């Protein structure tokens, strides 16, 4: 939220779910954030550097949390031949 | 859902995506049209014609392969019945039940059903009135109806 002179007001811009793009409430204590390790030349997980996601309370409570990750994984290329678009 | 019952059945015919076809028919409209009127003179209603054409003579449905709906064929050939087949089979039924209603006067379930059928008839007939296929009055009458079947 901008203001009169393009100055940035509003005291915090919340996260958004990676699978429903819906706001993560300040008290969404089911909301999750998974950091996934990225690798280099064979094994050796590069520390402090992740491919990171965020799932909503809602999705996780629906049991869709896993399946959303598989579609989110392959998409950023973390899996191959797991998630299927057609079913 | 149903009109005169609590039924929600969907038993309906699914028509295929194919305004032309089939690649194996090959008999020309003129020869199937020749066949529709052949059965229509022998005293047959459009419904039970397409029944027989679909079962024995291959023809998937005459609206394609001839480009014209079966009743219009009869129409053009001057073989259109007096009252629409729709109504006839309604009226016929009502005529029936009404007879059974007379030898059986305590059949309260029959009386009730009779009301139903005659409601369908009138609601139907009121439509055929509206689209000029029945003369502006016509009316289903209890007494005279038995004359419209035979």
């Amino acid at each position: 939220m901008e203001n009169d002179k393009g100055q940035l007001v509003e005291l915090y811009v919340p996260r958004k779910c990676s699978a429903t793009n819906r706001i993560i409430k300040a008290d969404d204590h089911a909301s999750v954030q998974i950091n996934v390790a990225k690798v280099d030349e064979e094994g050796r997980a590069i520390p402090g550097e992740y491919v990171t996601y965020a799932l909503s309370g809602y999705v996780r409570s629906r049991g869709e949390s896993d399946d959303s990750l598989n579609r989110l994984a392959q998409n950023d290329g973390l899996l191959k031949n797991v998630w299927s678009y057609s079913r | 859902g149903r009109m005169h019952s609590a039924g929600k059945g969907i038993s309906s015919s699914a028509i295929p995506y194919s305004r032309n076809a089939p690649a194996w028919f090959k008999l020309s409209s003129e020869s199937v049209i020749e066949q529709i009127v052949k059965y229509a003179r022998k005293g047959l209603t459009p419904s039970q014609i397409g029944v027989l054409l679909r079962d024995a003579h291959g023809v998937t449905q005459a609206r394609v392969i001839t480009g014209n709906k079966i009743m219009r064929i009869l129409k053009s050939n001057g073989l259109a019945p007096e009252i629409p087949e729709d109504l006839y089979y309604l009226i016929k039924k009502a005529v029936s039940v009404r007879k059974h209603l007379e030898r059986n006067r305590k059949d309260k379930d029959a009386k009730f059903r009779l009301i139903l059928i005659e409601s369908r008839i009138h609601r139907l007939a009121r439509y055929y009135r509206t689209v000029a296929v029945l003369p502006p009055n016509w009316k289903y009458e209890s007494a005279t109806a038995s004359a419209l079947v035979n």
Binding site: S68, R71, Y85, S86 | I10, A14, V51, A56
Partner: protein
């Protein structure tokens, strides 16, 4: 579930759904070419025939109607087109 190509449902799931409830509804019945072993005639019947279809003559019998698919008589040929 949650995300899925509805435009492109799998042919195996699509053939499982109800007749009407396929992406674009379509029939499941077919037609036959049918003949009895003593005659070169080639009678063409429908799978869910409600008529006791005869051969060109010879007061025989090809199929008998039921509640669904008709039952072709005894010894006869048939190819599905």
């Amino acid at each position: 579930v949650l995300v899925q190509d509805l435009l492109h449902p799998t042919a195996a799931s699509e053939a499982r759904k109800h007749k009407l409830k396929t992406l674009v509804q379509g029939p499941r019945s077919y037609f036959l070419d049918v003949k009895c072993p003593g005659c070169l005639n080639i009678t063409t019947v429908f799978s869910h025939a409600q008529t006791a279809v005869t051969c060109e003559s010879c007061s025989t019998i090809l199929c008998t109607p039921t509640g669904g698919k008709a039952k072709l008589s005894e010894g006869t040929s048939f190819r599905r087109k």
